[PDB]
Automatic annotation (TrEMBL):
<comment type="function">
    <text>Sigma factors are initiation factors that promote the attachment of RNA polymerase to specific initiation sites and are then released. This sigma factor is the primary sigma factor during exponential growth.</text>
</comment>
<feature type="domain" description="RNA polymerase sigma-70">
    <location>
        <begin position="43"/>
        <end position="51"/>
    </location>
</feature>
<comment type="subunit">
    <text>Interacts transiently with the RNA polymerase catalytic core.</text>
</comment>
<feature type="short sequence motif" description="Interaction with polymerase core subunit RpoC">
    <location>
        <begin position="43"/>
        <end position="46"/>
    </location>
</feature>
<comment type="similarity">
    <text>Belongs to the sigma-70 factor family. RpoD/SigA subfamily.</text>
</comment>
<protein>
    <recommendedName>
        <fullName>RNA polymerase sigma factor RpoD</fullName>
    </recommendedName>
</protein>
Length: 51
DNA sequence: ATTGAGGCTGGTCATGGCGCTCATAAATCTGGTATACTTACCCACATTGGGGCTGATTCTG
């Protein structure tokens, strides 16, 4: 049971990582429009990645 | 140098606005979820150090 659920968790983590790497572009595109509101572009894109 | 009274040393009785403590409560402060589709920003000097030559002593075919 332990290693089966470990394999399942690893598969889920891989799929989620793939989704995040695919949608990084959308994150950047959304974060483009808040670059002049007292926050850095890198901070904005990191918050977008978290979201 | 005594004994007859005033001024002044001991404690009575609460008294009274102040401060710490309890409790109520609406305003203030935090966390949370939204499903038509949106995918790569915007000057002049002096000195030391790194990298590319430049021979110049060692070895070679």
């Amino acid at each position: 049971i332990n290693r089966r659920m470990s394999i399942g968790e690893a598969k889920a983590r891989r799929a989620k990582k793939e989704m995040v790497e695919a949608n990084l572009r959308l994150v950047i595109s959304i974060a483009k429009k808040y670059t002049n509101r007292g926050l850095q572009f890198l901070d904005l894109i990191q918050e977008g990645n978290i979201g």
